[PDB]
Ligand binder design. Structure first.
Ligand SMILES: Nc1ncnc2c1ncn2[C@@H]1O[C@H](COP(=O)(O)OP(=O)(O)OP(=O)(O)O)[C@@H](O)[C@H]1O
Ligand SMILES: [Mg+2]
Ligand SMILES: [Zn+2]
Ligand SMILES: [Zn+2]
Ligand SMILES: [Zn+2]
Lengths: 159, 773, 65, 114, 243, 134, 263, 43, 83, 98
RNA sequence: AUCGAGAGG
C-alpha cells in the first residue's frame, strides 16, 4: 500500500509499505504478535473491534464500515447522517441492530414499537406489564391524530 | 400500519404529468376539471366579501366559483341543487368552499417518496389540459419522466396549513439538498444541451434575434448590451446575452486542467459581476454541481432569486434552441474507417493477451476470470475512448456527452465500438450445459467469445450467440428492479423506524423520544447540512518553508518583512516590540493549528466540508469595494490581528454562563476557527488580499452573520432526514441497471447485502478480513 | 380500414387513388414504386399512405349482417 | 374533455380587445402591445418591418404560452416618435408590399396562360 | 411507443403551421427528443427509420429480420440514389420565422403504436365523496370516487419537512376525525354521552362529572375498541401523572 | 474618451483550434521590443493571415446607456478602422519587474497584452474598444 | 410593380412553382403560413345519419365525409355560421348535401363522393360540388356496401378555415426554399469526411451562381429570393389559393390597423 | 392473443433467470416485469 | 418549571418552524375577524397581512420553547430576531 | 469439423411478441423486453368480427397500417393483415422544449 | 365485501 507520510521538509510523500491481509479474524491473538503495529491493526468485523477495543472503537469501526459502503462508487453523503446512524446504534453500550430484535426492544412507548413489527405481541406485553405511554413520540401522536412534537409543533404559541 | 400510520385522504388528485418550459420552477399546471373538483374552504372577511359572493353567484360550473357555503351552524348550502342567489348574501364567519384558483400552495408528490424532495409545495396555475404540467428542472428531485408517469396533488384546507406549505415545503426552499450539501435541482435536458452550444466562442447572434432573446427575459432592465463586435457587423456573443439572466453581483471562478485566464479550450469558468468572462457553460457549472452557479445564487441572494434564475436561463436557452435545432441519427454512431480498424486491433491483441493468460491457467482460485474480466473491461474502455476521441465536434451524440445532458462514455463505446463483456450475478456467463455455455460451442472452451464477450457494436449488430448472451446479461437488470428493490426498501423502512423520533431540541442537543441524548450537539458541530461547502484548509498542507513564507511576519529582521508598499504606516512598523508581540502569537497559533489539523487528518487531506465559504466573501468584498492593487492598504496590524480574535468570540453555537456549555462551544467551533485563521492572516489580508479597513469590517460582519445562519433550527427531524439520506441513494442506485444491461456494478449486487450486515450487525460476515501493518 | 382519405402529413387527397393503384399493380403488371409514381404521389409522406395500407373492409364485407 | 375550443384561436371574447396598449417604464418612450387571437404569422411580419424603421430602437415579440393565442410586442422608438405611429407605418408598409405582390402575381399568371 | 421500448406521451400538439418543414414541404407527424436515444441505446430505432425512408421512397418492403446481411452502409447507398443524404439527415426550416436551422434534423417514417393508457382514463380528483363503513375512511378506487393513500413513506417525508399541522390535517380533517367521550377516572370510551339533555354518564365507576371529549381518528377508536374486545385496556388520560 | 494604447503588431501565428469562425492570433510589436499580443479574432468578419501588420488602438470610447443601432449622419469613432470589439478587463498581472499584462474579454474572445510602461493608461474599466486597422 | 416580384417558372392545374424576389423572409413565411391556415374553404361539417346498415361506424363515415374536398371558388359570398341570423341549416351560410346508397348489386357496391347530391339552393354560386380529378370519373371512395346494406345521410357544409380543423385547408403541400447554395451560412452542414459530396445538390442551385471558392464571407447579405411551390387539394385553384393567401394577410394587417385607429 | 395462447407459468433469484438451456425453447426477450419477471415465460 | 427572563440560554433568532407557525397562526386569526394592528392598505390576503405585521414586529404572540426536561422559556415575537 | 446439426434459422428463438421488433440485434435487450411487453398493449384490429362480439373494452384503430420495415417472421404471425400501428413521420429534434 | 388475475409508473 501507499501511505501519505509527512516528509522532513513538511511535504506529504506517498511512501510504500507492506500490509498483510488475512482471511479470518483472530484480532485478540494477532494484535499481540511481535513485529506488527498494535496501534494500526484494523478489521472489517466491527463486532470484534468492540469485544477487544471497546464500544467507542466499535463506533469508529462501524462508521468506517458504513462509509466504505455508502461512499464506494464515489457517492457522497454528509457526515452528519452516518454519524447519527452510528451513534443511535451505540448509545446503549453495545451494537444495537436496526431490527425488531435490536431497536424495537427499548423502553419506548408501546404505540411506537407496535407500529414497526410484532404489533400484537408488543400490545399484549404492554397490557400484561401495564406500560404507561408518555405520548412524546411521533407514532404515538399520529395514531391519536394530534400535532406531534415535530418542528412547527415542538413549541406552544400563547397570546 | 394500514389505517393509522397511512390513510386515504380527501382533496387529492392524481394525473399524468408532462413538461412545460413556460412554467416557473415553483408552479404546477392544474387541469381545469381538477381545479373545479378540489376545493378550499375560505372564511368570508370584510376584505373579500365581493370576490367571495361573486364566486358564489358564479356557481360550481364556471371555473372561478364555489361548490358550498358552510354556515356558522354547520349546515351546508349546495350551490348545484339549492338556490345560489337572492338572500344568499354572505355574513361574517361563514365558510365558502371555493374552487382552486391561481397562486394556491398545494402539496405535490410522486411515489415512491424516497426522500423529502419527492414531496414539495407548488403554486397552482390553471391549465386547459388533463396533465400535471411541471418545470423541467424540478423533475430531478421527483425522479420523474413524462412517458406515462402520474403524480398526486394534495390541497391544504386551512390557513395555518397553507402557511406551513408555503414556508417550509416550497420548491425554492428545497433547491439545496441537506443530503450531500449540494443543489438537487439544475438545468436538465435540452436546456443543458443548448447552454453549451449557446456559450461557445464560435456562436454569434445578430440584432434581430438578440432583441427577441432579451425580451424573453422577464426581469430584463431594458438596456441593450453593447455588442462584442461593432464595426464590421454588430454581433453579440452567446455569453453576452446569456449573462443577462445571471443576477448582478455573482462571482464564480472555475479552473479545469486546461483552464487559464485565456482558457484556450474554454475550460473552467469565470463569472465576474454576473458576466461570463470565459468558459463553456455545462453540467459542472449550471447543473447539480458541488460549487456551481446554482449553489452560489442560492447561498447568496435568495432561493427565490435562484428560482427566477432557473426560468430566466430556461426561456433564453429554449428560445435559442428553437431557432437553431438539434438532432441525432445513424451517422452520429458511425466511426471513421481508419479509426475502426485500430479499434479492431485494440480488441484483437487484448483478446490474444487473454489467450496468454489461459496459458498461465494450466500447470476458489479464480484470480483468472477476475483478471480476465478486468482485462476485457479495460479493452472495452480503451476502444471506446479511441472511438470517442476520433469523433468530430459536430457529432450530435458527442455534444450530448460534452454537455452532460444525457449519455456517457459507455454509451459511445457500446453503440460505436463494442458492447463488451456480459456478466450475470457478478460473474461471466456460466456453463448451463455440460462444459459449455451454448450447444454451438465445443466442450472445454474458455475463449472470451465462448463465455459472453460481445465483440460487435449495436451499429454493426449482434450475432445470435452474442444476442443470447446479451439477453442473459440484461435480464439481471430487470430482476433487481422487481425483486431486489424490496430488499432495499425494507432497509429504508427499518432505518426510518429506528431514527423516527430523533430530533434537535432547543438546547442544541440531539435526543430520542425518551430524552436520551444521542448527541450533545447535532453532527458534533451543530450546523445545518444545507449550509456547508467543501473548503480547503491551507495550514495543513505544504512545506514548512512554504507555510512560513505564507504566514510568518517579522518586523525586526529582513528575513520575513512586510513590504512598506502594502500598508500606509508600513514605514514605522519596523521595530515596535509590542506589534511583534501581537504578531508572533498569531504565528504560534497557526503552528498549533497546523499540528492539530495534521493530528486530526492523518492523511493530510485539506478539502473538508465547512459551513461558511470565505473565498466567496473575499471576492465579494474585493468587487463590491473596488480595490486597486497599486495602493497601500488602510489596515493597522492591531486591527487585522485583533479583528479575527474578536470575531472568534461571536461565532456562538451554544449559549450558557456555566463552564460545561462554554467548553462545548470552544470545542464546537474549533476547526472552523482554524480555517478562519488560515484565511484571515496578516500576510493574507495585507499582501494576497489587499483589503482595506472598510472591506475588512464588511468581511468580518458577513462571516459572523452567515455563521449564525448555518446553525440548526431546533425542531429539525434529524433522524428521519438521516434515515432517508442513507436508503435513498441505495434505492435509486438499484431499480436502475437496466440502463446498461450487462455491466458489472458490485454495489448493487454485493453492496446492499453488506448494508444488510451492518444494520443488523450480522454475527457472521460473508468474508471477514484482518488488515495488519 | 377502408382507404386513408387525405394525408396526415400534408393533406393531399389519396382516397381516390386506391382502385387505380390496384389496377396498375394487377392489370398493368407494374411494381409498387412505378405504380405509386404514375399516380402522382411524389412525396414519401403520401407514398407511404398507399404503400402501407391494409384493406380490411373487404373482410368486414364478408359477414352476413 | 379539458381541451379548449378550436375557434378560440381566432374569435375574440366578450369584453376582449384585439390590441391592449400599455406604456412600459423600463425604457423611455417604450410600449408593450398585447395582440389577442394572433400567432407568429402576424408577429414576425410586424417585427421585421418595425426593425426596418430608422427611428425604432427596439422591437420584439413573444408568445408566452403555446396554449393561448396571443402575443406581446414591445416597441421603443426615438424620442419624439410615437410608437403607435411606428406600428401604423409598419402596417401601411406591409399593406403596400402585399398589394404590389398581388398585382405582380396577377400579371405573371395572366402572362402564364398558354 | 415505437417497436423498441421508446415510449412517450404527447406533451404538446402543434398545428401544421408551427411545425418545422423541409424544403419539399414534408411536415413531421411526430417529433421526439434526441436525448431519448443516447442513454437508451436503441440504435434499431434509427436503423428502422432509415430503412423505412428507403422503402417508402423506393416502394419496396424493408427487410428487418434480425440476423441478416443487411447493413447500414447498404441502406445508405440506397437512400443516396433517391436524392437524399445517406445518413437520413434533412435540412428543415423553422415554422415560426421560416429561417433555416443550423442543425439538420433526422427525419423519416417510423412505425408507432398507440397504447391503452390515456389521460381521460387516469385523471381523478376527490372532494369528500363516498367513505367506507368499517373504518369510515375514503373508499379505494377511481371507479368508486375514492381518495389516494397518504402512505407511511409520505408521512415520513412530511415529518422531515417539519410540518406538523399539515400532517394532522391530512390525518384528521381529510380522513376520520371522530370525537369520542372519555371518562376522567377509568379513561375508557365508556361515557354514555346523551346529547340534547346535557347529561353524560359512565356506569361502572359512577362518574358523571369528569368527562372530556377528544378528537381522534375513527381508526384509532376502532383500534381501542378491538383492544378492549381482546382483554386490553388502552386507558386514555388527559393529564400527566409523571413528568 | 481618448485612446489608451496605440501600436503596430506583426502577426506570427494564427491558431484555428476547434473553432470555424474564431482564430487565436499571436503578434509582436513592430516598434517597441517587449510588447506582445494574444487575441481571438472573428475570421469570417476580419480574416487574418501570418506575417500581417495590424494597427491596434484602445479607444475605450467612441466620441452606460443602451446600445443604439448606427444611423447616417454621425461619425463618432472607429470609422477609419476595420475591426472593432468592446469588452471588459478582468486581470492585471505582474509578469516581471519591468513587465505588466492586462487581460480583456470581448464577450468571450480573450486578449492578453504585455508591456513595460506603455500599459499605463489601461485601467480596470469596461470601457475598452479594441480597434484594429489593416 | 415596385416591391415584390414573381416569376412563374412552372404552372399546372394543381401546382405552381414560382420565385419571389425583393422580399424579406418574414413576409414569405407569413404568406405560406396564411396559405396553409387562414384561407376559407367549404367542407362538410354536420352529418345526420338516417340509415346505416354498413360495417362502418356513423362517426367514421362522418369524419371521412368531412375530409372530402368541395368546390369553394365562390366561398367569399357565404356567411359564417356564427355571423348568420339563421339556424343549423340555411341557404346563405351553408350548403345541404344528401347521400343515398343501396347495395343492390350482387358484388360489392362502392359509394363515391360522386354520389353526393346538392339539395339546397346555390343561388347561382360556383360552390358546393364534390371535386372529381380521377380520370375514371369517380370521386373519393366514401364507403362500400355488400348487399341489402343502405346508407342515408344529410350533410351540412359550412365555411371555415384550416385553423379550426384541417379539413378546411386547401393547400396540400407548399414547398419553400431559399439560398440553394449555403452563401448566407444559415445552415452548418453535417458531414463525415466531405461536406460538399455527402449533401445532394438541390435543383434550385441551377438558378444561382455557385459561391466561387475563396471569396470573403458576405456578412451584409440577406435572404431575398425564395423558391416556392404551392399545391392545392382542389377546392380553390392554385392561383386563387396564392392570391387569397395574400389577400387574407393584407386583411389581417388592415384589421389591426383599423383596430388601432378605432382605439 | 397469440402471446396469451403460448404462455407458461412457473409456480414459485435463480428461478427468475434466463438459463443457458432456454435457447430456442423459451423467448429470451418476452417476459413480464410486474414482479413476475422470469417466472412467466413464452414459447 | 419556567426559566426566568434572564438566564435564558436559547437562540434569540427565530427558527423557520417558529416563523412559519407564527405566520400561520396570525393568518388564521386574521381570517377570523381579529383586530389588525398595522395599516394593511391594499393587502387583503390574510397571510400578506401576517407577513406585514411580522416585518414591523406587531404580532402579539409569544413562543414557549420547551426544553427536554419539561421546563420552558417564553420568547416574545417582538423580542426574537428575524433573518 | 464435428458438426452434428444445423439450426433452421437463428431468428426462430424469439417469441410472438419479440418477432415484431425490427433489427432486435441492434438494440439493447431491456428495450426488446419493453417492446415485447408493450406489443400486447398496441391498439389495432384484434379480430375481423369485432362488430359481432359483445365483449367489454374493444379498441379498434381507424386506419391500421402495415409496417414499412417488416421482419420475415411477420408472415406467419399475420401482422401484415391485422397490424397494430401506423407509419408516422418522425423527426428527432429539440424543437420547442415540449 | 372476499378472492384472484393481469397491467402501469
Ligand atoms: N417496483 C418499483 N418500486 C418502486 N418504484 C418503481 C418500481 N417500478 C417502477 N418504479 C418507479 O418508476 C420509475 C421507472 O421508470 P421507467 O420504468 O419508465 O424506466 P426509466 O428509468 O424511466 O427509463 P426508461 O423510461 O428509459 O425505461 C422509477 O423512477 C420508480 O420511481
Ligand atoms: Mg405485470
Ligand atoms: Zn402527403
Ligand atoms: Zn368511567
Ligand atoms: Zn344561416
Amino acid at each position: 500500500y501507499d501511505r501519505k507520510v509527512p516528509s522532513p521538509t513538511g511535504e506529504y510523500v506517498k511512501e510504500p509499505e507492506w500490509v498483510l491481509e488475512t482471511d479470518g479474524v483472530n484480532l485478540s491473538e494477532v494484535m499481540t504478535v511481535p513485529g506488527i503495529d498494535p496501534t494500526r491493526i484494523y478489521t472489517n468485523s466491527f463486532i470484534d473491534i468492540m469485544e477487544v477495543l471497546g464500544i467507542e472503537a466499535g463506533r469508529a469501526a462501524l462508521y468506517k464500515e458504513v462509509y466504505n459502503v455508502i461512499a464506494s462508487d464515489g457517492s457522497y453523503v454528509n457526515y452528519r447522517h452516518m454519524a447519527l446512524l452510528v451513534d443511535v446504534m451505540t448509545t446503549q453500550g453495545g451494537l444495537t441492530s436496526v431490527t425488531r430484535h435490536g431497536f424495537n426492544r427499548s423502553n419506548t412507548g408501546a404505540l411506537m414499537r407496535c407500529s414497526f413489527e410484532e404489533t400484537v405481541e408488543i400490545l399484549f406485553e404492554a397490557g400484561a406489564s401495564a406500560e404507561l405511554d408518555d405520548c412524546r413520540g411521533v407514532s404515538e401522536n399520529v395514531i391519536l391524530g394530534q400535532m406531534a412534537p415535530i418542528g412547527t409543533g415542538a413549541f406552544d404559541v400563547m397570546i | 400500519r394500514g389505517n393509522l400510520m397511512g390513510k386515504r385522504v380527501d382533496f387529492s388528485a392524481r394525473t399524468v404529468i408532462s413538461g412545460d418550459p413556460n412554467l416557473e420552477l415553483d408552479q404546477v399546471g392544474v387541469p381545469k376539471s381538477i381545479a373545479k373538483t378540489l376545493t378550499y374552504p375560505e372564511v368570508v372577511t370584510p376584505y373579500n366579501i365581493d370576490r367571495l359572493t361573486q364566486l358564489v353567484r358564479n356557481g360550481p360550473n364556471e371555473h372561478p366559483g364555489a361548490k358550498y357555503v358552510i354556515r356558522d351552524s354547520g349546515d351546508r348550502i349546495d350551490l348545484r341543487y339549492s338556490k345560489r342567489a337572492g338572500d344568499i348574501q354572505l355574513q361574517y364567519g361563514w365558510k365558502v368552499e371555493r374552487h382552486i384558483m391561481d397562486n394556491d400552495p398545494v402539496l405535490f408528490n410522486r411515489q415512491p417518496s424516497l426522500h423529502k424532495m419527492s414531496m414539495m409545495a407548488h403554486r397552482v396555475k390553471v391549465i386547459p389540459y388533463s396533465t400535471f404540467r411541471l418545470n423541467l428542472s424540478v423533475t430531478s428531485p421527483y425522479n420523474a419522466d413524462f412517458d406515462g408517469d402520474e403524480m398526486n396533488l394534495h390541497v391544504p384546507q386551512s390557513e395555518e396549513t397553507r402557511a406551513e406549505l408555503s414556508q417550509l415545503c416550497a420548491v425554492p426552499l428545497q433547491i439545496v439538498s441537506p443530503q450531500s450539501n449540494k443543489p438537487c435541482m439544475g438545468i436538465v435536458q435540452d436546456t443543458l444541451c443548448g447552454i453549451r452550444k449557446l456559450t461557445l466562442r464560435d456562436t454569434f447572434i445578430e440584432l434581430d434575434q438578440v432583441l427577441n432573446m432579451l425580451y424573453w427575459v422577464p426581469d430584463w432592465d431594458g438596456v441593450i448590451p453593447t455588442p462584442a463586435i461593432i464595426k464590421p457587423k454588430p454581433l453579440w456573443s452567446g455569453k453576452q446575452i446569456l449573462s443577462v439572466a445571471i443576477p448582478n453581483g455573482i462571482h464564480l471562478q472555475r479552473f479545469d486542467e486546461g483552464t487559464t485566464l485565456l482558457s484556450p479550450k474554454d475550460n473552467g469558468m469565470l463569472i465576474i459581476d454576473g458576466q461570463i468572462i470565459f468558459g463553456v457553460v455545462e453540467k459542472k457549472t449550471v447543473g447539480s454541481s458541488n460549487g456551481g452557479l446554482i449553489h452560489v445564487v442560492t447561498r447568496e441572494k435568495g432561493p427565490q432569486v435562484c428560482a427566477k434564475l432557473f426560468g430566466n436561463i430556461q426561456k433564453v436557452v429554449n428560445f435559442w434552441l428553437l431557432h437553431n435545432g438539434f438532432s441525432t441519427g445513424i451517422g452520429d454512431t458511425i466511426a471513421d474507417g481508419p479509426t475502426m480498424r485500430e479499434i479492431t486491433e485494440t480488441i484483437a491483441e487484448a483478446k490474444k493477451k487473454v489467450l496468454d493468460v489461459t496459458k498461465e491457467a494450466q500447470a476458489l482460485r479464480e484470480s483468472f476470470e477476475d483478471n480476465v474480466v478486468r482485462f476485457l473491461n479495460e479493452a472495452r474502455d480503451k476502444a471506446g475512448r479511441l472511438a470517442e476521441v476520433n469523433l468530430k465536434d459536430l457529432n450530435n451524440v458527442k455534444q450530448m456527452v460534452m454537455a452532460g445532458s444525457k449519455g456517457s462514455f459507455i454509451n459511445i463505446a457500446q453503440m460505436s465500438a463494442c458492447v463488451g463483456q456480459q456478466s450475470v450475478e457478478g460473474k461471466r456467463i456460466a456453463f448451463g450445459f455440460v462444459d459449455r455455455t451454448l450447444p454451438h460451442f465445443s466442450k472445454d472452451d474458455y475463449s472470451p467469445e465462448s463465455k459472453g464477450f460481445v465483440e460487435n457494436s449495436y451499429l454493426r449488430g449482434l450475432t445470435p450467440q452474442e444476442f443470447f448472451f446479451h439477453a442473459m446479461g440484461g435480464r439481471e437488470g430487470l430482476i433487481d428492479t422487481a425483486v431486489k428493490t424490496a430488499e432495499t426498501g425494507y432497509i429504508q423502512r427499518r432505518l426510518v423506524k429506528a431514527l423516527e423520533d430523533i430530533m434537535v431540541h432547543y438546547d442544541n442537543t440531539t435526543r430520542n423520544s425518551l430524552g436520551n441524548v444521542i448527541q450533545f450537539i447535532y453532527g458534533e458541530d451543530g450546523m445545518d447540512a444545507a449550509h456547508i461547502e467543501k473548503q480547503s484548509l491551507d495550514t495543513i498542507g505544504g512545506s514548512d518553508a512554504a507555510f512560513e513564507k505564507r504566514y510568518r511576519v517579522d518586523l525586526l529582521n529582513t528575513d520575513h518583512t512586510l513590504d512598506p508598499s502594502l500598508l500606509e504606516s508600513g514605514s514605522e512598523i519596523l521595530g515596535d516590540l509590542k506589534l511583534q508581540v501581537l504578531l508572533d502569537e498569531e504565528y504560534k497559533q497557526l503552528v498549533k493549528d497546523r499540528k492539530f489539523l495534521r493530528e486530526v487528518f492523518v492523511d493530510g487531506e485539506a478539502n473538508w466540508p465547512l459551513p461558511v465559504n470565505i473565498r466567496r466573501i473575499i471576492q465579494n468584498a474585493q468587487q463590491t469595494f473596488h480595490i486597486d492593487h497599486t495602493k497601500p492598504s488602510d489596515l493597522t496590524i492591531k486591527d487585522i490581528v485583533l479583528g479575527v480574535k474578536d470575531l472568534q468570540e461571536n461565532l456562538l453555537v451554544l449559549r450558557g454562563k456555566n463552564e460545561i456549555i462554554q467548553n462545548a462551544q470552544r470545542d464546537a467551533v474549533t476547526l472552523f476557527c482554524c480555517l478562519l485563521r488560515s484565511r484571515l492572516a496578516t500576510r493574507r489580508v495585507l499582501q494576497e488580499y489587499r483589503l482595506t479597513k472598510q472591506a475588512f469590517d464588511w468581511v468580518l460582519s458577513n462571516i459572523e452573520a452567515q455563521f449564525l445562519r448555518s446553525v440548526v433550527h431546533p425542531g429539525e427531524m434529524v433522524g428521519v432526514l438521516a434515515a432517508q439520506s442513507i436508503g435513498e441513494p441505495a434505492t435509486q442506485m438499484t431499480l436502475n441497471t437496466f440502463h446498461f444491461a450487462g455491466v458489472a456494478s458490485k454495489k448493487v449486487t454485493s453492496g446492499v447485502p453488506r448494508l444488510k450486515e451492518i444494520l443488523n450487525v450480522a454475527k457472521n460476515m460473508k468474508t471477514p478480513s484482518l488488515t495488519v501493518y | 380500414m377502408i382507404v386513408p382519405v387525405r394525408c396526415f402529413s400534408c393533406g393531399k387527397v389519396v382516397g381516390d387513388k386506391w382502385e387505380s393503384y390496384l389496377n396498375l399493380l394487377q392489370e398493368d403488371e407494374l411494381d409498387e414504386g412505378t405504380a405509386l409514381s404514375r399516380l402522382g404521389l411524389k412525396r414519401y409522406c403520401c407514398r407511404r399512405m398507399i404503400l402501407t395500407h391494409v384493406d380490411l373492409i373487404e373482410k368486414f364485407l364478408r359477414y352476413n349482417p | 374533455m379539458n381541451a379548449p375550443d378550436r375557434f378560440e384561436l381566432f374569435l375574440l371574447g366578450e369584453g376582449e380587445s384585439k390590441l391592449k396598449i400599455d406604456p412600459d417604464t423600463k425604457a423611455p418612450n417604450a410600449v408593450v402591445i398585447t395582440f389577442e387571437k394572433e400567432d407568429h404569422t402576424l408577429g414576425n411580419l410586424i417585427r421585421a418591418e418595425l426593425l426596418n424603421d430608422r427611428k425604432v430602437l427596439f422591437a420584439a415579440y413573444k408568445v408566452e404560452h403555446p396554449f393561448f393565442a396571443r402575443f406581446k410586442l414591445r416597441i421603443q422608438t426615438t424620442e419624439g416618435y410615437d410608437p403607435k405611429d411606428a406600428l401604423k407605418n409598419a402596417c401601411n408598409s406591409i399593406i403596400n408590399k402585399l398589394g404590389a405582390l398581388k398585382t405582380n402575381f396577377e400579371t405573371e399568371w395572366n402572362l402564364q396562360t398558354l | 411507443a415505437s417497436r423498441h421500448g421508446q415510449k412517450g406521451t404527447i406533451g404538446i400538439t402543434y398545428r401544421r403551421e408551427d411545425m418545422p418543414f423541409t424544403a419539399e414541404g414534408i411536415v413531421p407527424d411526430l417529433i421526439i427528443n434526441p436525448h431519448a436515444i443516447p442513454s437508451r441505446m436503441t440504435v434499431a430505432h434509427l436503423i428502422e427509420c432509415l430503412l423505412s425512408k428507403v422503402a417508402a421512397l423506393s416502394g419496396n418492403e424493408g427487410d428487418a429480420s434480425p440476423f441478416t446481411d443487411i447493413t447500414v452502409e447498404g441502406i445508405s447507398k440506397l437512400l443516396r440514389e433517391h436524392g437524399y443524404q445517406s445518413r437520413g439527415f434533412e435540412v428543415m426550416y423553422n415554422g415560426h420565422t421560416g429561417k433555416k436551422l443550423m442543425a439538420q434534423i433526422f427525419f423519416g417514417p417510423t412505425y408507432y403504436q398507440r397504447l391503452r393508457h390515456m389521460v381521460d382514463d387516469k385523471i381523478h380528483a376527490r372532494a369528500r365523496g363516498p367513505m367506507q363503513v368499517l373504518t369510515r375512511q375514503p373508499v379505494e378506487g377511481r371507479s368508486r370516487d375514492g381518495g389516494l393513500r397518504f402512505g407511511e413513506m409520505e408521512r415520513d417525508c412530511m415529518i422531515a419537512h417539519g410540518a406538523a399541522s399539515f400532517l394532522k390535517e391530512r390525518l384528521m380533517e381529510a380522513s376520520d376525525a371522530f370525537r369520542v367521550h372519555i371518562c376522567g377516572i377509568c379513561g375508557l370510551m365508556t361515557v354514555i354521552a346523551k346529547l340534547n339533555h346535557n347529561q353524560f354518564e359512565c356506569k361502572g365507576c359512577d362518574n358523571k362529572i369528569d368527562i372530556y371529549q377528544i378528537h381522534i381518528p375513527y381508526a384509532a377508536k376502532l383500534l381501542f375498541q378491538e383492544l378492549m374486545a381482546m382483554n386490553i385496556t388502552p386507558r386514555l388520560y388527559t393529564d400527566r401523572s409523571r413528568d | 474618451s481618448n485612446t489608451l494604447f496605440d501600436d503596430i503588431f506583426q502577426v506570427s501565428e494564427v491558431d484555428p483550434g476547434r473553432y470555424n469562425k474564431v482564430c487565436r492570433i499571436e503578434a509582436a510589436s513592430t516598434t517597441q521590443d517587449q510588447c506582445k499580443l494574444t487575441l481571438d479574432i472573428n475570421v469570417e468578419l476580419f480574416p487574418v493571415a501570418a506575417q500581417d501588420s495590424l494597427t491596434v488602438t484602445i479607444a475605450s470610447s467612441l466620441n452606460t446607456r443602451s446600445w443604439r443601432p448606427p444611423q447616417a449622419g454621425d461619425r463618432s469613432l472607429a470609422d477609419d478602422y476595420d475591426y472593432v470589439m468592446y469588452g471588459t478587463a478582468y486581470k492585471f498581472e505582474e509578469v516581471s519587474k519591468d513587465l505588466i499584462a492586462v487581460y480583456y474579454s470581448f464577450g468571450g474572445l480573450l486578449m492578453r497584452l504585455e508591456g513595460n510602461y506603455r500599459n499605463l493608461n489601461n485601467l480596470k474599466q469596461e470601457n475598452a474598444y479594441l480597434l484594429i486597422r489593416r | 410593380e415596385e416591391g415584390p416580384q414573381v416569376k412563374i417558372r412552372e404552372a399546372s392545374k394543381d401546382n405552381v412553382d414560382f420565385i419571389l424576389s425583393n422580399v424579406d423572409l418574414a413576409m414569405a413565411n407569413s404568406l405560406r403560413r396564411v396559405m396553409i391556415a387562414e384561407i376559407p374553404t367549404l367542407a362538410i361539417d354536420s352529418v345526420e345519419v338516417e340509415t346505416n346498415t354498413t360495417v362502418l361506424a356513423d362517426e367514421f363515415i362522418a369524419h371521412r365525409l368531412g375530409l372530402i374536398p368541395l368546390q369553394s371558388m365562390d366561398i367569399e359570398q357565404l356567411e359564417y355560421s356564427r355571423d348568420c341570423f339563421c339556424e343549423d341549416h340555411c341557404d346563405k351560410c351553408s350548403v345541404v348535401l344528401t347521400l343515398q346508397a343501396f347495395g343492390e348489386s350482387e358484388s360489392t357496391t362502392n359509394v363515391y363522393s360522386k354520389d353526393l347530391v346538392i339539395v339546397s339552393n346555390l343561388m347561382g354560386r360556383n360552390i358546393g360540388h364534390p371535386i372529381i380529378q380521377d380520370k375514371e370519373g369517380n370521386g373519393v371512395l366514401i364507403c362500400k356496401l355488400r348487399k341489402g346494406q343502405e346508407l342515408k345521410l344529410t350533410c351540412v357544409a359550412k365555411k371555415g378555415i384550416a385553423k379550426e380543423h384541417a379539413k378546411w385547408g386547401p393547400a396540400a403541400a407548399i414547398e419553400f426554399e431559399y439560398d440553394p447554395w449555403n452563401k448566407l451560412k444559415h445552415t452548418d452542414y453535417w458531414y463525415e469526411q466531405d461536406s460538399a459530396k455527402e449533401w445532394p445538390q438541390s435543383k434550385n442551385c441551377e438558378y444561382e451562381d455557385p459561391p466561387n471558392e475563396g471569396d470573403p464571407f458576405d456578412y451584409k447579405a440577406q435572404a431575398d429570393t425564395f423558391y416556392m411551390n404551392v399545391e392545392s387539394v382542389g377546392s380553390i385553384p392554385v392561383d386563387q389559393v396564392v392570391v387569397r393567401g395574400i389577400d387574407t394577410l393584407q386583411k389581417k394587417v388592415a384589421s389591426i390597423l383599423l383596430a388601432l385607429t378605432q382605439m | 392473443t397469440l402471446s396469451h395462447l403460448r404462455r407458461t407459468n412457473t409456480p414459485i433469484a435463480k428461478p427468475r433467470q434466463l438459463h443457458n438451456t432456454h435457447w430456442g425453447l423459451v423467448c429470451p426477450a418476452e417476459t413480464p416485469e410486474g414482479q413476475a419477471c422470469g417466472l412467466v415465460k413464452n414459447l | 418549571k419556567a426559566i426566568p427572563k434572564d438566564q435564558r440560554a436559547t437562540t434569540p433568532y427565530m427558527t423557520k418552524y417558529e416563523r412559519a407557525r407564527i405566520l400561520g397562526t396570525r393568518a388564521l386569526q386574521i381570517s377570523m375577524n381579529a383586530p389588525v394592528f398595522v395599516d394593511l392598505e391594499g393587502e387583503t390576503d390574510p397571510l400578506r397581512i401576517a407577513m406585514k405585521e411580522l416585518a414591523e414586529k406587531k404580532i402579539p404572540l409569544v413562543i414557549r420553547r420547551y426544553l427536554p426536561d419539561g421546563s420552558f422559556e417564553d420568547w416574545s415575537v417582538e423580542e426574537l430576531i428575524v433573518d | 469439423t464435428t458438426f452434428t446439426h444445423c439450426e433452421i434459422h437463428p431468428s426462430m428463438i424469439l417469441g410472438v411478441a419479440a418477432s415484431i421488433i425490427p433489427f432486435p440485434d441492434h438494440n439493447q435487450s431491456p428495450r426488446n423486453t419493453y417492446q415485447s411487453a408493450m406489443g400486447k398493449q398496441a391498439m389495432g384490429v384484434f379480430l375481423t368480427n369485432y362488430n359481432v362480439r359483445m365483449d367489454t373494452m374493444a379498441n379498434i384503430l381507424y386506419y391500421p397500417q402495415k409496417p414499412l420495415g417488416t421482419t420475415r417472421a411477420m408472415e406467419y404471425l399475420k401482422f401484415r393483415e391485422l397490424p397494430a400501428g401506423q407509419n408516422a413521420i418522425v423527426a428527432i429534434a429539440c424543437y420547442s422544449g415540449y
